[PDB]
Design an enzyme around this catalytic site. Sequence first.
Site, mmCIF file in Angstrom:
data_model
loop_
_atom_site.group_PDB
_atom_site.id
_atom_site.type_symbol
_atom_site.label_atom_id
_atom_site.label_comp_id
_atom_site.label_asym_id
_atom_site.label_seq_id
_atom_site.Cartn_x
_atom_site.Cartn_y
_atom_site.Cartn_z
ATOM 1 N N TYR A 170 -12.103 -74.391 -27.600
ATOM 2 C CA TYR A 170 -12.236 -72.851 -28.211
ATOM 3 C C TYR A 170 -11.485 -72.093 -28.287
ATOM 4 O O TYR A 170 -11.893 -70.986 -28.218
ATOM 5 C CB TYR A 170 -13.405 -72.276 -26.516
ATOM 6 C CG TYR A 170 -13.928 -73.276 -26.120
ATOM 7 C CD1 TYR A 170 -14.716 -74.813 -25.184
ATOM 8 C CD2 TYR A 170 -15.665 -72.813 -26.351
ATOM 9 C CE1 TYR A 170 -15.774 -74.785 -25.074
ATOM 10 C CE2 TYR A 170 -17.131 -73.665 -26.026
ATOM 11 C CZ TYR A 170 -16.827 -74.232 -25.240
ATOM 12 O OH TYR A 170 -17.938 -75.081 -24.671
ATOM 13 N N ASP A 218 -16.352 -80.508 -27.499
ATOM 14 C CA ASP A 218 -16.068 -79.386 -26.816
ATOM 15 C C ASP A 218 -15.487 -78.923 -26.277
ATOM 16 O O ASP A 218 -15.334 -78.737 -24.940
ATOM 17 C CB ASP A 218 -17.164 -78.070 -26.629
ATOM 18 C CG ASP A 218 -18.258 -77.448 -28.023
ATOM 19 O OD1 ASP A 218 -18.186 -78.074 -28.920
ATOM 20 O OD2 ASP A 218 -19.083 -76.978 -28.199
ATOM 21 N N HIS A 241 -24.714 -75.395 -22.281
ATOM 22 C CA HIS A 241 -23.681 -75.205 -21.138
ATOM 23 C C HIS A 241 -24.674 -75.425 -19.847
ATOM 24 O O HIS A 241 -25.177 -74.103 -19.063
ATOM 25 C CB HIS A 241 -23.251 -73.991 -21.422
ATOM 26 C CG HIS A 241 -22.558 -74.102 -22.686
ATOM 27 N ND1 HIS A 241 -22.014 -72.472 -23.607
ATOM 28 C CD2 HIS A 241 -21.444 -74.656 -23.058
ATOM 29 C CE1 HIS A 241 -21.287 -73.031 -24.205
ATOM 30 N NE2 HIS A 241 -20.975 -74.416 -24.560
ATOM 31 N N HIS A 256 -32.014 -71.765 -25.135
ATOM 32 C CA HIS A 256 -30.352 -72.508 -26.775
ATOM 33 C C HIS A 256 -30.242 -73.922 -26.931
ATOM 34 O O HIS A 256 -30.028 -74.319 -26.542
ATOM 35 C CB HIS A 256 -28.763 -72.399 -25.460
ATOM 36 C CG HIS A 256 -27.490 -71.500 -26.150
ATOM 37 N ND1 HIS A 256 -25.914 -71.652 -25.416
ATOM 38 C CD2 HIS A 256 -27.536 -71.139 -27.479
ATOM 39 C CE1 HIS A 256 -25.645 -71.279 -26.507
ATOM 40 N NE2 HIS A 256 -26.021 -70.678 -27.387
ATOM 41 N N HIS A 257 -29.432 -73.314 -28.088
ATOM 42 C CA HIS A 257 -29.753 -74.414 -28.744
ATOM 43 C C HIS A 257 -31.117 -75.294 -28.898
ATOM 44 O O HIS A 257 -30.617 -76.833 -29.115
ATOM 45 C CB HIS A 257 -28.372 -75.582 -29.037
ATOM 46 C CG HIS A 257 -26.821 -74.982 -29.132
ATOM 47 N ND1 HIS A 257 -26.830 -74.605 -29.762
ATOM 48 C CD2 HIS A 257 -26.190 -74.617 -27.718
ATOM 49 C CE1 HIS A 257 -25.533 -73.380 -29.730
ATOM 50 N NE2 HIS A 257 -25.380 -73.786 -28.375
ATOM 51 N N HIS A 265 -23.208 -79.484 -25.288
ATOM 52 C CA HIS A 265 -23.192 -78.386 -26.075
ATOM 53 C C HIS A 265 -24.333 -76.744 -25.665
ATOM 54 O O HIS A 265 -24.210 -75.824 -25.264
ATOM 55 C CB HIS A 265 -23.857 -78.847 -27.599
ATOM 56 C CG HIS A 265 -24.096 -78.036 -28.416
ATOM 57 N ND1 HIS A 265 -23.411 -77.055 -28.839
ATOM 58 C CD2 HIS A 265 -25.705 -78.046 -29.171
ATOM 59 C CE1 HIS A 265 -23.752 -76.595 -29.687
ATOM 60 N NE2 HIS A 265 -24.807 -76.618 -30.359
ATOM 61 N N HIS A 269 -22.083 -84.894 -29.605
ATOM 62 C CA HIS A 269 -22.275 -83.705 -28.921
ATOM 63 C C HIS A 269 -24.095 -83.223 -28.811
ATOM 64 O O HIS A 269 -23.476 -82.159 -27.481
ATOM 65 C CB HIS A 269 -21.119 -82.557 -29.512
ATOM 66 C CG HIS A 269 -21.360 -81.273 -28.557
ATOM 67 N ND1 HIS A 269 -20.295 -80.985 -27.959
ATOM 68 C CD2 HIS A 269 -21.691 -80.037 -29.687
ATOM 69 C CE1 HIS A 269 -20.966 -80.022 -27.254
ATOM 70 N NE2 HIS A 269 -21.112 -78.681 -28.290
ATOM 71 N N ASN A 317 -19.012 -78.907 -32.050
ATOM 72 C CA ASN A 317 -18.963 -77.556 -32.648
ATOM 73 C C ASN A 317 -17.445 -76.707 -32.837
ATOM 74 O O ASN A 317 -17.177 -76.401 -34.295
ATOM 75 C CB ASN A 317 -20.184 -77.335 -32.527
ATOM 76 C CG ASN A 317 -20.493 -76.340 -32.089
ATOM 77 O OD1 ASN A 317 -20.554 -77.465 -30.408
ATOM 78 N ND2 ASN A 317 -21.098 -74.942 -31.672
ATOM 79 N N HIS A 318 -17.255 -76.480 -31.743
ATOM 80 C CA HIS A 318 -15.948 -76.306 -31.478
ATOM 81 C C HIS A 318 -15.204 -76.546 -32.061
ATOM 82 O O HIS A 318 -13.744 -76.212 -32.332
ATOM 83 C CB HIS A 318 -15.602 -75.650 -30.122
ATOM 84 C CG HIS A 318 -16.590 -74.296 -29.944
ATOM 85 N ND1 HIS A 318 -16.144 -72.821 -29.933
ATOM 86 C CD2 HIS A 318 -18.173 -74.520 -29.247
ATOM 87 C CE1 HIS A 318 -17.788 -71.855 -29.979
ATOM 88 N NE2 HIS A 318 -18.234 -73.251 -29.095
ATOM 89 N N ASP A 333 -17.518 -79.209 -22.877
ATOM 90 C CA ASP A 333 -17.845 -78.056 -23.478
ATOM 91 C C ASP A 333 -16.653 -77.002 -22.137
ATOM 92 O O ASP A 333 -17.314 -76.783 -21.589
ATOM 93 C CB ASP A 333 -19.243 -77.689 -22.865
ATOM 94 C CG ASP A 333 -19.938 -78.192 -24.430
ATOM 95 O OD1 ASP A 333 -20.212 -77.847 -25.144
ATOM 96 O OD2 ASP A 333 -20.112 -79.171 -24.005
HETATM 97 FE FE LIG Z 1 -20.028 -76.037 -25.805
HETATM 98 ZN ZN LIG Z 2 -21.028 -77.229 -28.474
#
Ligand SMILES: [Fe+3]
Ligand SMILES: [Zn+2]
Lengths: 423, 426
Positions: B161, B158, B319, B289-290, B317, B280, B195-196, B129
């Site tokens: 971005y 990632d 952060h 988060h996630h 994924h 990821h 995913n980015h 990321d």
């Molecule tokens: Fe990320």
């Molecule tokens: Zn991600």
Amino acid sequence: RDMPLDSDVFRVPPGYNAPQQVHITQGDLVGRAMIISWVTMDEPGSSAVRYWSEKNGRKRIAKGKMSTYRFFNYSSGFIHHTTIRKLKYNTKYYYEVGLRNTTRRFSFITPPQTGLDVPYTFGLIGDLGQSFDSNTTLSHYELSPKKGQTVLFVGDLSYADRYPNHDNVRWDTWGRFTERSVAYQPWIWTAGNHEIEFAPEINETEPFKPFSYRYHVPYEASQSTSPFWYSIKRASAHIIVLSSYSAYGRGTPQYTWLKKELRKVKRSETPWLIVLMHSPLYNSYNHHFMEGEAMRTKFEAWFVKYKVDVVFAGHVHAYERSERVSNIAYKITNGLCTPVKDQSAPVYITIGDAGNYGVIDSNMIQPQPEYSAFREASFGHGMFDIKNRTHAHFSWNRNQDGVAVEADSVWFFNRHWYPVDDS
Amino acid sequence: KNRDMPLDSDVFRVPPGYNAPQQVHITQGDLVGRAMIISWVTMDEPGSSAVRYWSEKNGRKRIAKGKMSTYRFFNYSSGFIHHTTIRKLKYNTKYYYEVGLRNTTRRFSFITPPQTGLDVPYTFGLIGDLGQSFDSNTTLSHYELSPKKGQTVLFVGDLSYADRYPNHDNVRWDTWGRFTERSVAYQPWIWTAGNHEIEFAPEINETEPFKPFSYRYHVPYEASQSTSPFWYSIKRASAHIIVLSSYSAYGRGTPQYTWLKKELRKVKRSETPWLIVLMHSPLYNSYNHHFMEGEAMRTKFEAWFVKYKVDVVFAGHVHAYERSERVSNIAYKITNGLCTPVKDQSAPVYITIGDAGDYGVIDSNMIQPQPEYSAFREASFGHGMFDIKNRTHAHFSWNRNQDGVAVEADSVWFFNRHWYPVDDST
Ligand SMILES: [Fe+3]
Ligand SMILES: [Zn+2]
Ligand SMILES: *[C@@H]1O[C@H](CO)[C@@H](O[C@@H]2O[C@H](CO)[C@@H](O)[C@H](O)[C@H]2NC(C)=O)[C@H](O[C@@H]2O[C@@H](C)[C@@H](O)[C@@H](O)[C@@H]2O)[C@H]1NC(C)=O
Ligand SMILES: *[C@@H]1O[C@H](CO)[C@@H](O[C@@H]2O[C@H](CO)[C@@H](O)[C@H](O)[C@H]2NC(C)=O)[C@H](O[C@@H]2O[C@@H](C)[C@@H](O)[C@@H](O)[C@@H]2O)[C@H]1NC(C)=O
Ligand SMILES: *[C@@H]1O[C@H](CO)[C@@H](O)[C@H](O)[C@H]1NC(C)=O
Ligand SMILES: *[C@@H]1O[C@H](CO)[C@@H](O)[C@H](O)[C@H]1NC(C)=O
Ligand SMILES: *[C@@H]1O[C@H](CO)[C@@H](O)[C@H](O)[C@H]1NC(C)=O
Ligand SMILES: *[C@@H]1O[C@H](CO)[C@@H](O)[C@H](O)[C@H]1NC(C)=O
Ligand code: VN3
Ligand SMILES: [Fe+3]
Ligand code: NA
Ligand code: NA
Ligand SMILES: [Zn+2]
């Protein structure tokens, strides 16, 4: 137990370049269109469809597209897909294909305009195949006094991939065999694992290739970017078709599409919210036990949030009807992993018992779990018969019973318009 | 809120000269380390895809020929992307290579890995990321300055971005390519799709998943008989690295599922004792988060990881940083109530290392209390190092951006699951 190539159900319609494997499905979002599909074997032919309503008797022409494909050493005939548009609601239409050489004529009846109390009878067929059991199931469906008006087909069509090199001739036979139903009423297609046909050993690495050439769906009408997930509305129902064997991680096309689609559902226009997928999220049979867990973790909570009425699946070659349950309270360490009664959740029906290649799934995990209302390992089909916005009657017919006999049946009370305990 | 480095930053400077190659990056080009994919962009005209290369020893200069491609994304038009594979290299030797042979030539170098083998040491950097904020630059600086000397980056997804920008402004792919070149032009980075990278944007008629990423970052996926760039395997020194796609299909019978099942059977721990999985989205994650996004893939693949005694699974994924205990949660059968992770000395350690900087935001909200399956977790920017010493021991360290480059806020000895499966708990 697959029917031999010389079976009557596989006969080739006579005449030079006679259309065969004729099949139709809904061609738009709301029912004013139909995709007309067929194959010509002797030469490309015309992709024109001549059609007219019984009411107005005005013959019209719609133009379509021809395609071909190869699979290993098989070469397809000429596949035609033609969309007839701007049809009148609740109207009988005749249509003809093969306009250049040998013409063949069929008919269908468009659904009524979508609306709150519009009755409609859906057939439920899954894992059909082309065994003698398959033929019996199709016979029972077409002989049913409930009179199905559209089949919701939950995947695993021809089982051609069981043959050497997936011998795609068995796709052609399946199309000729199912024509007696699907040329006259739409079948709504769901992709199952026998449609994947991922065969890198013979350099066929494109998932769903033969299926996707032969069976088109109106996926753009719901802003989907792929044929393998899409929505249609018909009468009082909003039907969401999902792809068990496509990506559904967060942010993937299918996941993104479904999240937005569920926000678009208007239960004030289509009260009956129906989801089709091949692999069942709830399944107490040994065969394929817990294969549905991955999609369940992603989508089950959304089904409950949006009060889906019913989820139909196949894949397991048997019949099962769940209680309304959910298993959405799990948080890794809290021990909450047992399904509980949840009146906001859909009923999960496995209906993958239309015949396949002749094998029933009889091994069941014992005892019957609390989440399972009824299960039986018999061949048969379903019928989901909507009466109005609050009531729909589901019945299951067995091949060993009379065509008018229902071995299981239950009244569905609508989750949005009438959330009374329909246990 | 906008912590991205401005376009005029020094890290984004354009290499001078007419049609000078820019965004130069390399990665392993075959299964075992004798090949390298060389990648770069020319902006003024197509130019040559030839790569000139020679070892520092014999010095015989050879030419490899590659391919040029372009793409469009909404109203963005790419420059000219080159990918060229150099093959049949000698192991453990320094090579020079040159790109831009028609007009402005630029020269770089890399060092091939040793031949694969049971006791071959090798130092892997871990970065997830990354992005292009000032935090990203600090992380990259910390990695380049590591006393442990990373030789290859395992990148868990990632990248740029750019999809956060209006219409995913793909100029921000170009800037990221120029920013990261100072590392990846000289040592391979092993790409995982996050995913980015999906960049599914139907609202602007861009519906091909992974399009900009897949044009810009090639991987040797055919070398492991995968049919997709998004999942593949490579071997390097004593490690066998399996790269998975969190955002591709993994249902039973799907290409990725089928590929992985067969690939695990090809692992030979007497040749590459270190079995490493990249993906990821983390299967184990105690941050809010996630939280639990990895459950679906976990249901499909966790049991396989335990059966094959994967040493470690790296993910991004989230952060932040997290290191699990060796646990498995594979006993559940719907009605048997067995849904709590248990200590399991055949299981991998799961490490979340998605904290290299992204667009400048850290994930600090955690599930409370820290669950038993979580050994260590902290919401700080940084990067990791997986330092293989031999067939029994590998040393993993986590360096924080707020610390000195030599300081390891977390570290642990990995004891190999095949040759030395001792409890290595923190
Ligand atoms: Fe990320
Ligand atoms: Zn991600
Ligand atoms: C919606 O469809 C239901 C199923 O046909 C209707 O219930 C049926 O109503 C009949 C009288 O019209 C009655 O003889 C049937 O037994 C009954 N079937 C059941 C309950 O399974 C329903 O009709 C309303 O609800 C029932 C329970 C009675 O109160 C009727 O008087 C109501 O009209 C339909 N709802 C409507 C028409 O609003
Ligand atoms: C693999 O590398 C390990 C880390 O360098 C070796 O362990 C280290 O061995 C040093 C000298 O033998 C000793 O001073 C260090 O304390 C030790 N480090 C750790 C973290 O234990 C390892 O050597 C074997 O294992 C250790 C535990 C001792 O039993 C040594 O006598 C062994 O040779 C290396 N294992 C190999 C080469 O098989
Ligand atoms: C299939 O069923 C139909 C209708 O019952 C029957 O006419 C036909 O002979 C059957 N064909 C078989 C079993 O091959
Ligand atoms: C395809 O190849 C198989 C052998 O693998 C052969 O038996 C079959 O007849 C071939 N079909 C055609 C149409 O050539
Ligand atoms: C693309 O469109 C954006 C938004 O209108 C604009 O700011 C940008 O300059 C455009 N890029 C081009 C035309 O290369
Ligand atoms: C990025 O870091 C490098 C090396 O630490 C430094 O020279 C450069 O000025 C930095 N650029 C920024 C922060 O924009
Ligand atoms: O090998 V020389 O052109 O520096
Ligand atoms: Fe089936
Ligand atoms: Na299974
Ligand atoms: Na599956
Ligand atoms: Zn199936």
